[PDB]
Amino acid sequence: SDPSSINGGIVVAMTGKDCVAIACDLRLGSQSLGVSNKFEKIFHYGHVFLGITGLATDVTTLNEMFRYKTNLYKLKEERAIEPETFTQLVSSSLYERRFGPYFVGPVVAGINSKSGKPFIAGFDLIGCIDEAKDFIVSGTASDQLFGMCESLYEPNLEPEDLFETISQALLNAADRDALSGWGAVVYIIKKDEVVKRYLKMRQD
Amino acid sequence: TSIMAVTFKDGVILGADSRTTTGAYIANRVTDKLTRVHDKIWCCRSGSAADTQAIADIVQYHLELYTSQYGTPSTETAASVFKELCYENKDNLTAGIIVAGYDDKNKGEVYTIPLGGSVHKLPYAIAGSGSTFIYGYCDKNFRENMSKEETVDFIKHSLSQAIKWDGSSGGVIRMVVLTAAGVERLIFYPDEYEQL
Amino acid sequence: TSIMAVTFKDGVILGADSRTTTGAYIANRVTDKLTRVHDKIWCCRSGSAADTQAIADIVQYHLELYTSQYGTPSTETAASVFKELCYENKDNLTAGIIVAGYDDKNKGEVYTIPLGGSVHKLPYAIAGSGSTFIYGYCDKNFRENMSKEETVDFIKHSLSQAIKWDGSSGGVIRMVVLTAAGVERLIFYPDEYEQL
Amino acid sequence: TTTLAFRFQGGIIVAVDSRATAGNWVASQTVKKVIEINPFLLGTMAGGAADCQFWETWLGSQCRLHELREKERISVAAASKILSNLVYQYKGAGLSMGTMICGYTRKEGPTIYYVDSDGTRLKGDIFCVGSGQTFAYGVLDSNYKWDLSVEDALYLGKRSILAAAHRDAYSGGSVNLYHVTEDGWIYHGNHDVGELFWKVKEEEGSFNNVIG
Amino acid sequence: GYDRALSIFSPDGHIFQVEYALEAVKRGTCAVGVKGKNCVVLGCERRSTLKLQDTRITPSKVSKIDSHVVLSFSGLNADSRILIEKARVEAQSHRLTLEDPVTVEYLTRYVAGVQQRYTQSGGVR
Amino acid sequence: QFNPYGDNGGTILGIAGEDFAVLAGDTRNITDYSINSRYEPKVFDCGDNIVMSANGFAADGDALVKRFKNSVKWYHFDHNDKKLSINSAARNIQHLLYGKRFFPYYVHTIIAGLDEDGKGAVYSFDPVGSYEREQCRAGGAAASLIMPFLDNQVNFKNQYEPGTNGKVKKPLKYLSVEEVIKLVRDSFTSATERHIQVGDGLEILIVTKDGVRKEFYELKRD
Amino acid sequence: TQQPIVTGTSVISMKYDNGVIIAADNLGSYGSLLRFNGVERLIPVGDNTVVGISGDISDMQHIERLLKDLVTENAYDNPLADAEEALEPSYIFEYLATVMYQRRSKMNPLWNAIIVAGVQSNGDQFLRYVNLLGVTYSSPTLATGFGAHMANPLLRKVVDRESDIPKTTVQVAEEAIVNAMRVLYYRDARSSRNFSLAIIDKNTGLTFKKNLQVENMKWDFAKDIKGYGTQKI
Amino acid sequence: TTIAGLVFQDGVILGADTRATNDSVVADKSCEKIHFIAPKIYCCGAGVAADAEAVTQLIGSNIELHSLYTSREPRVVSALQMLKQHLFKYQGHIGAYLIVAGVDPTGSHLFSIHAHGSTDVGYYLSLGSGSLAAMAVLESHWKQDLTKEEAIKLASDAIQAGIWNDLGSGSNVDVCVMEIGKDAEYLRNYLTPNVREEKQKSYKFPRGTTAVLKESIVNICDI
Amino acid sequence: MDIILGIRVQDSVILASSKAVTRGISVLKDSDDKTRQLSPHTLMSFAGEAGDTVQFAEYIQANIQLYSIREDYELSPQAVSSFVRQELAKSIRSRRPYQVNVLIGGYDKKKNKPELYQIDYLGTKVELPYGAHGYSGFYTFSLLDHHYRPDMTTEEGLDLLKLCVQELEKRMPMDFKGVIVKIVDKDGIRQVDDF
Amino acid sequence: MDIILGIRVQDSVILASSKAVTRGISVLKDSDDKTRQLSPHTLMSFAGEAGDTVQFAEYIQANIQLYSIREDYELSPQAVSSFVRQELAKSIRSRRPYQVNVLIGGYDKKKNKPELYQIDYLGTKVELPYGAHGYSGFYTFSLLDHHYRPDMTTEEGLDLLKLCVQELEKRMPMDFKGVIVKIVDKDGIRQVDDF
Numbered sequence A: 001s002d003p004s005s006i007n008g009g010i011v012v013a014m015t016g017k018d019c020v021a022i023a024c025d026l027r028l029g030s031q032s033l034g035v036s037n038k039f040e041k042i043f044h045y046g047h048v049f050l051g052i053t054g055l056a057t058d059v060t061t062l063n064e065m066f067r068y069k070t071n072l073y074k075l076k077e078e079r080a081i082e083p084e085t086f087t088q089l090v091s092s093s094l095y096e097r098r099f100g101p102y103f104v105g106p107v108v109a110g111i112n113s114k115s116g117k118p119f120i121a122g123f124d125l126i127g128c129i130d131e132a133k134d135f136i137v138s139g140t141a142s143d144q145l146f147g148m149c150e151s152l153y154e155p156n157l158e159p160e161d162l163f164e165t166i167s168q169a170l171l172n173a174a175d176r177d178a179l180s181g182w183g184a185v186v187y188i189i190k191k192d193e194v195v196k197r198y199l200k201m202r203q204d
Numbered sequence B, C: 001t002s003i004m005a006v007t008f009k010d011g012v013i014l015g016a017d018s019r020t021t022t023g024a025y026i027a028n029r030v031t032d033k034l035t036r037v038h039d040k041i042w043c044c045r046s047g048s049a050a051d052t053q054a055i056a057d058i059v060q061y062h063l064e065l066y067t068s069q070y071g072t073p074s075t076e077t078a079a080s081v082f083k084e085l086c087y088e089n090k091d092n093l094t095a096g097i098i099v100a101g102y103d104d105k106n107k108g109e110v111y112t113i114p115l116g117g118s119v120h121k122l123p124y125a126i127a128g129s130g131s132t133f134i135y136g137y138c139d140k141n142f143r144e145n146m147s148k149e150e151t152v153d154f155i156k157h158s159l160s161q162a163i164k165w166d167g168s169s170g171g172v173i174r175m176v177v178l179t180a181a182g183v184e185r186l187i188f189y190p191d192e193y194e195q196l
Numbered sequence D: 001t002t003t004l005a006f007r008f009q010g011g012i013i014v015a016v017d018s019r020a021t022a023g024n025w026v027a028s029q030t031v032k033k034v035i036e037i038n039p040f041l042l043g044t045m046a047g048g049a050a051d052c053q054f055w056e057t058w059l060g061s062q063c064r065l066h067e068l069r070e071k072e073r074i075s076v077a078a079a080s081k082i083l084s085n086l087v088y089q090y091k092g093a094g095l096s097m098g099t100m101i102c103g104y105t106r107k108e109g110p111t112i113y114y115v116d117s118d119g120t121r122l123k124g125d126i127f128c129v130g131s132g133q134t135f136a137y138g139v140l141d142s143n144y145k146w147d148l149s150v151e152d153a154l155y156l157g158k159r160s161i162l163a164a165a166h167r168d169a170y171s172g173g174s175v176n177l178y179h180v181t182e183d184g185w186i187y188h189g190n191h192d193v194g195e196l197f198w199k200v201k202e203e204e205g206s207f208n209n210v211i212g
Numbered sequence E: 001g002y003d004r005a006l007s008i009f010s011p012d013g014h015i016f017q018v019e020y021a022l023e024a025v026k027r028g029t030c031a032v033g034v035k036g037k038n039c040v041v042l043g044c045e046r047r048s049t050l051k052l053q054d055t056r057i058t059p060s061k062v063s064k065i066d067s068h069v070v071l072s073f074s075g076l077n078a079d080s081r082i083l084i085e086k087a088r089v090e091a092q093s094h095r096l097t098l099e100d101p102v103t104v105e106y107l108t109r110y111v112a113g114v115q116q117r118y119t120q121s122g123g124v125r
Numbered sequence F: 001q002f003n004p005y006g007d008n009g010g011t012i013l014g015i016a017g018e019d020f021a022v023l024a025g026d027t028r029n030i031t032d033y034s035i036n037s038r039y040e041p042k043v044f045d046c047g048d049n050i051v052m053s054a055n056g057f058a059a060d061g062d063a064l065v066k067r068f069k070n071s072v073k074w075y076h077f078d079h080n081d082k083k084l085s086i087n088s089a090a091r092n093i094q095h096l097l098y099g100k101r102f103f104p105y106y107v108h109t110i111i112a113g114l115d116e117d118g119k120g121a122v123y124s125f126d127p128v129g130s131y132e133r134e135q136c137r138a139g140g141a142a143a144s145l146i147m148p149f150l151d152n153q154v155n156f157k158n159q160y161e162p163g164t165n166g167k168v169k170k171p172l173k174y175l176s177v178e179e180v181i182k183l184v185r186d187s188f189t190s191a192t193e194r195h196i197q198v199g200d201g202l203e204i205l206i207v208t209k210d211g212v213r214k215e216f217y218e219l220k221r222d
Numbered sequence G: 001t002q003q004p005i006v007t008g009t010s011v012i013s014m015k016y017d018n019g020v021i022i023a024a025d026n027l028g029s030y031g032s033l034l035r036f037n038g039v040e041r042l043i044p045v046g047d048n049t050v051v052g053i054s055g056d057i058s059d060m061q062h063i064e065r066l067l068k069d070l071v072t073e074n075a076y077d078n079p080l081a082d083a084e085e086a087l088e089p090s091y092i093f094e095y096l097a098t099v100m101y102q103r104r105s106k107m108n109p110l111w112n113a114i115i116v117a118g119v120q121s122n123g124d125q126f127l128r129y130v131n132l133l134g135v136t137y138s139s140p141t142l143a144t145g146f147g148a149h150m151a152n153p154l155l156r157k158v159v160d161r162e163s164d165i166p167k168t169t170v171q172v173a174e175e176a177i178v179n180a181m182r183v184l185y186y187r188d189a190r191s192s193r194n195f196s197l198a199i200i201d202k203n204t205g206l207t208f209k210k211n212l213q214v215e216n217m218k219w220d221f222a223k224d225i226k227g228y229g230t231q232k233i
Numbered sequence H: 001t002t003i004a005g006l007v008f009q010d011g012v013i014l015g016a017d018t019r020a021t022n023d024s025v026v027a028d029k030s031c032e033k034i035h036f037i038a039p040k041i042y043c044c045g046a047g048v049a050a051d052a053e054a055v056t057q058l059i060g061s062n063i064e065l066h067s068l069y070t071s072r073e074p075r076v077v078s079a080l081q082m083l084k085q086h087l088f089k090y091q092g093h094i095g096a097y098l099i100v101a102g103v104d105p106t107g108s109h110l111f112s113i114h115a116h117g118s119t120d121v122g123y124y125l126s127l128g129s130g131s132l133a134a135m136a137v138l139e140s141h142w143k144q145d146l147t148k149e150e151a152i153k154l155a156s157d158a159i160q161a162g163i164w165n166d167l168g169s170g171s172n173v174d175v176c177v178m179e180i181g182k183d184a185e186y187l188r189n190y191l192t193p194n195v196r197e198e199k200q201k202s203y204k205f206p207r208g209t210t211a212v213l214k215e216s217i218v219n220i221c222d223i
Numbered sequence I, J: 001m002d003i004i005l006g007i008r009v010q011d012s013v014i015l016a017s018s019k020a021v022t023r024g025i026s027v028l029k030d031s032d033d034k035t036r037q038l039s040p041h042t043l044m045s046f047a048g049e050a051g052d053t054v055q056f057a058e059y060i061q062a063n064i065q066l067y068s069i070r071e072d073y074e075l076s077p078q079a080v081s082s083f084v085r086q087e088l089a090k091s092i093r094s095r096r097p098y099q100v101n102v103l104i105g106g107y108d109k110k111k112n113k114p115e116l117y118q119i120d121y122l123g124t125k126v127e128l129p130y131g132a133h134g135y136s137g138f139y140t141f142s143l144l145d146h147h148y149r150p151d152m153t154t155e156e157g158l159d160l161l162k163l164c165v166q167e168l169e170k171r172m173p174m175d176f177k178g179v180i181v182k183i184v185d186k187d188g189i190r191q192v193d194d195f
């Protein structure tokens, strides 16, 4: 009945030294029934990464919407959109549906190509921006993620250390949520290389 | 309903209108809401007519049996018996009762028992739907140790206004005077009190 | 809320308390409920604060535009504009407004506009939650063609009682005097009016 | 929750998952859903955890009193009916129970009774109860035979819970196995579903959909 | 209710009401039970003081408690009907709850228990 | 309509070591968005080397603890001052809770102590009396924030040995009392940051063969 | 199950170095009608305890009678009724807390919030709260209703933790209580100007102050406030 | 949320806490609830956080265009009128509760604004779940002709009362001071009374702890 | 429980009752016998709320068996049906009523006649040549009205019953997993094992 | 409508859809084809609310056929599924939403690969090796998880499907009256007439 917890799933994002990480589980369900173990929740538009939890039809719809908008942005601006600007575009787009909202929990992650500054942001379903220095959490196990991140996180982690921290935060949070899990992906993002890693986890 | 009781120098006076309504229909225009539980202990009834009559009949029984054993009860004792019934059966009662009485020791006393079944001893009390419209008037015009004639005028003027504004109140203004001299009934008709 | 407007020999006086509540919390204890729609046409507001402010702002706009075209509007005209907004939007408004004004031709006039959006021209009017407690007092004490000092006392005593009994009313008593001489604001503090 | 029990040549297999949830939140992965009524009788937990624990512990007390008084092992029929008659008295009050009472006596042989909080009492060969019951039934129905060995039957019960643990969001954690014989039940271990899944995937060639 | 202790100990450690109940049994018509290898036989005396009796309808001395268990008695006839009724009810109650008919030992133990209860309950003989 | 239940917030945590047990709880008591008390003890010594906490609706929590303490007293009278073992205490608490099955004590109960072999023991109860022995159990408001962290740091879930890449699990080595207390403190500090009902103070009761000891630590008061 | 009819608003209280202070206004409200202006809601029990009660007044009068009956009962066959076996604050509280929890457990509560303030035999300060649900708690400052939201923040600035209690004198504590009562009069629509205040001190005993008034009120700034936005007159 | 506003000698000051809470969990520990409308007009936002931000930005945009059109510096009464008329139109469905303060050619002003569109004038105001705690402090200590140093003290004290005593409020204190004839000074993290203590342990993992199925390079570069 | 049918022919009563037991989502059993022998020549089939059906049936069975032992005599089908009706009629104004519908098929050894009684959960009794409970009558009664004769043999009664079950299997949405069929005549009660 | 199953094997997609149409009390039909050919190598099966299912299916069919004529070209299965998803995603925030769940089985002639897409009424799209809608997955997925291989032949896929239908016929309460089975491969769409 609650649209934000029909399909399930989680996203977490973290900052490190000259890098950001964003990660998500791979489950899509119909309440108790597991439907797909390949439903990725992280997308990218140039060098800006967008994770989206919540109702899966809206996750797909918003991805297609921001692809549309960032493509037109690029053609007109003659440059790729930056994380700070994209964050405002996500907020605007969500708030324009104030009284018929998309049931989602978006998360932005990326590095500003000109300043080199790591950037993360989270939103509620109507576009309120949370621009955290440390970490952003989203989804059906957001409480569990808050608990993991708040203890596991320390600032200025190197990319390969940050990978371990965000992975362990996601995995152990997902294992305490019925509607999350069934595989996981972690993106490690630096200024001009991005590594994607699929994690091995319990499949129940 | 508009009811009040007022203490004065020689004792206490209870006052009431005579209207009983079922919705907007006046079921009885000459109701007697001033009721006797003992020789010089009376009460004014508001709320459910069934409930307040049932209570008053039980109290009258309790004070009659009290009198046979222990002699004349105090007004405080009568108020206590009313309170006991109202408080213990608060879930199944809609009763707002003012108890007024005359002792020779204590003189005129007034106790008000609202919906909850609490007791409040007061120099005067007002109650019933029509009382809302005269809180201002009664507070400005009441004095302690008034004469009989002044107190009759105070009650007459007060209930006149309560009747004027409240649709649920109307008819005749009945009064009962309680003093050492005895028990006096008074009645005041519309043509008298409306022109005040 | 306790609000009133009273006509007298030289014109009209509007009076109000200053309490605004959200449930039992007093959100503002120094509210100004006497509001200006034209130079010598004011109103008292009761009901939804949002609604009455929205209405009063629209009326002020209508009378400003009236004045640019047709000269000074009558108090009756102001009451009519208020009524039109209240009556046509009765389903979406909770507004109880008293309109008071001074012409040189008509002198002091008072119009009350209750919830339904009806209009009633009166010698004086009372409204707001606290007005229920002073219907008796106001009816007994109002006279036509009072002096300024008598009318100020009448409003001060009346709203004093309304404040005393109504939890929703309180704070300072604000007043606005409308005469040929001009517009005078008055304020009365708790230590003054509580001892009356 | 996923609980199953089935009769076969070598007695009864009982297999259960270990997960308990409160909404989406996974409260426990280490729940004991087989109640050890006595050394010869087992019961399964589904619906209300307290209702199943309390009244099947109580059932053990009534079975003990029976054999003291009658100098003989209580039948599975009589044990199950003590419980069903008890819960039937409470019908309407809001008890929540779905359980298999499992035993192996001389006079009856291996016997399973499905007992339930609206008063149902059914004898049967195969039962599956819980949110993941439909998944377990699929594996059971297609592979069940009377002439299964004890080893193969234990695996079938283990594999059927795994099927449910994978698909059903409210089932998982670990698999507890029991084998009921005439001389009593025998515990066949706690098996983590995480470790079991990968083991079964590789050895059996199943779950090709899942990347490992 | 009538609570009077009728069955009580005497100085010599006897309960006279229980012993006087045995004297009522001594007066009753003779009953005998003999078990063979694959049967049991119950024999009963019928006193021939009473002729003109209707033997079709007169209460028979042997009573079925269930289809597999019988009860005969010696003593007060009216008293025996109360024990027979209670036993018959218990036999059906046992079938209903245990899903098995009573053993002969169980049924005996029940009837014997009822008899005992009436030797230390108030207001009963 | 009269609602007989309420929510006084709070969070509690029980951990069973090798030869010890801890039961920790925050000292904040709340209703809605108001603080009732910054120091209202929630974990109690019940005698016989058993510690108890009934978190949730504080009136039912106080009632249950009071009744259990009394049950320990009467166990001594009735059974010749025999020590009530932790397993026996647990079963007794089930009957206290299930006794009100149709008007429950609205609490999540945890007890801690030592079993009859001297090993650390924690038992966990739902409101109507279903119970289980456990190694690690958080209860109350911020339980969802604490348990994932404990799975990872006590039981070493999802942690494997470097160089093997998933093939060899990190071995389950035994934690000392000092190590457990560090994890308790860090759990509650993290919970305090992200849960509004958790804060003010942390009281930990430690149970060993020597007896029951107390430790108190400040938490953020916002 | 009932609903409260005639009601009393906030009871506020705090500990200081040698004892406790408790206060409550003299009003019995009938919904939004300020019906009864002479209601005493602080009820002393002996010379060492004061019970402050808010909520339903009929239930308060019942509790008042229970406490009066408690004192009578304690005196029965008790030569030390006015000495070692006198009623303690802790005894009175536990009794009330038992009654409150039992009544809620029969789905028929006494619709009140109660603060028991007093000083024990050994000189220790006693201050504890109980309500219609049987919920209990203790703190250096306690308040009911609106007092919880407005008085506690002010009183906690004086005594923020246990170690602030020995540093707080009776003059400072009373001052804080009196100021809190003024703030409640400004901001609580079901309060009154008239209140009672009780001090229970381990040296000077029970001082009960009746007919106090909120004074030194700031209203003068109201004259300059005009309209709700754009109005200049 | 605890937000407050009060006036002093030749100015007005706003205060706000920095905690955002969805249900019982703290979503953000350092958010800005004092919103920019114009260079010398600011707005404290309570209620629904998105609504308070969105409504201030829309009115702030329209105020800027108005300022350019009229060649005059914007007035607080214009921001007030535009906000209330917008909020009234939506009948409370935009759940914004705001305290608006600023300096303009007319002088210094302080208003409150409720979700349904009612406005109030005040010398000291507070809104949000911590308003009662904040107002207790303001009613105790506010006086006429406060100095700037006294005003900042009182404003932060009012917000602190909310932080400590309201579970809805927490973390740090933000302040904005608007004085006549001066630039407005926005003092974010004016007070920092809730820094987390150092942790007992370090939870940094050994490298290789996490099991990995697959590794791949993501192409983010233009074709 | 779902379908229970009854048909009284010349010299016997035939009762047909479905085998399925469904608990919401899954069919838990496909061989359930929804009947109890009350006496050697009286059979009762039943359908209604889970638990209550069997509890009621076994309670009736116990009482009739008690009567048989006490009197050394079998009650007539009419007498048994009146006893059952009264218990259901008592039940309907209880705190929690038995939601159980029954058919009672019996052979009266005194009159040498088969008898079928239909009793619903309210205690509404009717003697019929053929009967059903729930939706079973909606599908089958048009066939029974057409083909039924009072002088039918047992074999003709079974053939007419097959036609009724075939119509149920065609037009009913639920899979009731076939029927167990039992015959009540002068020799007692027996089950038709192939149907 | 009730059960719709899909399985993608080596070189084809197999869709199995129930034949029953029930309107409350009675089964009105037992030969209903719950599918439409969208293009020569794309088939869509459907289940959901009465009326809306066929109206939606035929509306999609018309639009894909229109595209085919305009461009003289067959859209890929992926393209068709994205078009169908958008229409359902548009629908869910309408005045009255289409309550329709679909499976799209297609053979991509460019890539030489079978493709199965599962789309629910909300517009939730997933590409799968096997899929179902409603309660069908609850019974069948444990069997498919066990036996499925990506290199299965069409004959092996049909045998695995028979096992799924047998399990449905055993444990489902409703009689869905068997299934029509259709195969989508490089040669187009054909119906398996004996199943």
Ligand SMILES: [Mg+2]
Pocket (backbone or CB within 6 Å): A174, A175, A176, A177, A178, A179, A180, A181, A182, A204
């Ligand atoms: Mg999971």
Ligand SMILES: [Mg+2]
Pocket (backbone or CB within 6 Å): A203, A204, D164, D165, D166, D167, D168, D169, D170, D171, D172
């Ligand atoms: Mg699972």
Ligand SMILES: [Mg+2]
Pocket (backbone or CB within 6 Å): B163, B164, B165, B166, B167, B168, B169, B170
């Ligand atoms: Mg009248």
Ligand SMILES: [Mg+2]
Pocket (backbone or CB within 6 Å): F221, F222, H162, H163, H164, H165, H166, H167, H168, H169, H170
């Ligand atoms: Mg706080």
